[PDB]
Design an enzyme around this catalytic site. Structure first.
Site, PDB file in Angstrom:
ATOM      1  N   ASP A 117       0.815  -1.217   0.000  1.00 24.10           N
ATOM      2  CA  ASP A 117       0.000   0.000   0.000  1.00 24.10           C
ATOM      3  C   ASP A 117       0.839   1.253   0.000  1.00 24.10           C
ATOM      4  OD1 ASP A 117      -3.002  -0.082  -0.001  1.00 24.10           O
ATOM      5  OD2 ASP A 117      -2.680  -1.580   1.588  1.00 24.10           O
ATOM      6  N   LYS A 119       0.024   4.116   0.986  1.00 23.51           N
ATOM      7  CA  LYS A 119      -0.702   5.366   0.793  1.00 23.51           C
ATOM      8  C   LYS A 119      -0.021   6.441   1.628  1.00 23.51           C
ATOM      9  CE  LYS A 119      -4.779   2.440   1.137  1.00 23.51           C
ATOM     10  NZ  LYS A 119      -3.995   1.299   1.707  1.00 23.51           N
ATOM     11  N   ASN A 122      -1.592   5.919   5.449  1.00 17.68           N
ATOM     12  CA  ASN A 122      -1.106   5.019   6.486  1.00 17.68           C
ATOM     13  C   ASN A 122       0.367   5.217   6.745  1.00 17.68           C
ATOM     14  OD1 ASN A 122       0.308   3.016   4.609  1.00 17.68           O
ATOM     15  ND2 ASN A 122      -1.806   2.805   3.911  1.00 17.68           N
ATOM     16  N   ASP A 135      -0.344   0.767   9.282  1.00 21.80           N
ATOM     17  CA  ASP A 135      -1.431  -0.142   8.927  1.00 21.80           C
ATOM     18  C   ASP A 135      -0.998  -1.209   7.947  1.00 21.80           C
ATOM     19  OD1 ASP A 135      -3.805  -1.453   8.330  1.00 21.80           O
ATOM     20  OD2 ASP A 135      -4.799   0.302   7.473  1.00 21.80           O
ATOM     21  N   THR A 139      -7.855   2.772  -1.566  1.00 21.66           N
ATOM     22  CA  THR A 139      -7.554   3.919  -2.435  1.00 21.66           C
ATOM     23  C   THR A 139      -6.304   3.720  -3.297  1.00 21.66           C
ATOM     24  OG1 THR A 139      -6.771   6.194  -2.486  1.00 21.66           O
ATOM     25  CG2 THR A 139      -6.470   4.982  -0.426  1.00 21.66           C
TER      26      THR A 139
END
Length: 254
Positions: A117, A119, A122, A135, A139
């Protein structure tokens, strides 16, 4: 057990289960504040990792189907409210927060943990104002192509994501988007890298090397991993010893 901790506030219905900011009452540390993830392995991972940019695990356990994790509470809030606040970061401002993350992905990887991820959501700051990855498993405008159409996987992905961050750090938004889950996806997989003009050469060079559609030749994919990346002269003013010792001053102190 769960009742040692009063609940102060809910943090995120986010993901599988929920996460509470809590305070402790019984036992040793008493009234320190904490975060308690409650799950009706994310654990496995947090348990080995012990790294100054990776959120710390304090206690684990379960009960009536409920597993409770108890992680350090992170007063810095999300990095990417700071983004919200200062529009776009100055090249330095960004090269800081980026290097840290970088040495985090670096660890993770020698321990065969890929983040997928990364992102801008996180990625948490701590009291001091440093970076703490948080996390594990929303998205997509931050994950590699080779995922979106399942391929696919390996360190590469992580580093692609890393462009998106930086790019989105030095420019108000990610490299690919547009008013549609569809067209956004489509736009990634046809990754026509539009650069700003105002990026120094290096910043641009890194991006063009991070965001490459072919993983294999994405900078950082090599067996040298976070080595290659950290090496690139975008981070030439970075003292990697100093940094992993939280002795370098973060351009925002929350």
């Amino acid at each position: 057990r769960p009742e040692c901790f009063e609940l102060l506030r809910v943090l995120g219905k986010g993901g599988y289960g929920k996460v509470f900011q809590v305070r402790k009452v019984t036992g040793a540390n008493t009234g320190k504040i904490f975060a308690m993830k409650v799950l009706k392995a994310e654990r496995n991972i947090l348990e080995e990792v012990k790294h100054p940019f990776i959120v710390d695990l304090i206690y684990a356990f379960q009960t009536g189907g409920k597993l409770y994790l108890i992680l350090e509470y992170l007063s810095g809030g999300e990095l990417f409210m700071q983004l919200e606040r200062e529009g776009i970061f100055m090249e330095d401002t960004a090269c800081f927060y980026l290097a840290e993350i970088s040495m985090a992905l670096g660890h993770l990887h020698q321990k065969g943990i890929i983040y997928r991820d990364l992102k801008p959501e996180n990625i948490m700051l701590n009291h001091q104002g440093h970076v703490k990855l948080t996390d594990f498993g929303g998205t997509i405008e931050y994950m590699a192509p080779e995922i979106l159409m399942r391929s696919g996987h390996n360190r590469a992905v992580d580093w692609w994501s890393l462009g998106a961050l930086m790019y989105d750090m030095l420019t108000g938004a990610p490299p690919f988007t547009g008013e549609n889950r569809k067209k956004t996806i489509d736009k990634i997989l046809k990754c026509k890298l539009n650069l700003p003009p105002y990026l120094t050469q290096e910043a641009r060079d890194l991006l063009k090397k991070l965001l490459k559609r072919n993983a294999a030749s994405r900078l950082g994919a090599g067996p040298g991993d976070a080595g290659e990346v950290q090496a690139h002269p975008f981070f030439r003013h970075i003292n990697w010893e100093e940094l992993l010792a939280r002795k370098v001053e973060p351009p925002f102190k929350p």
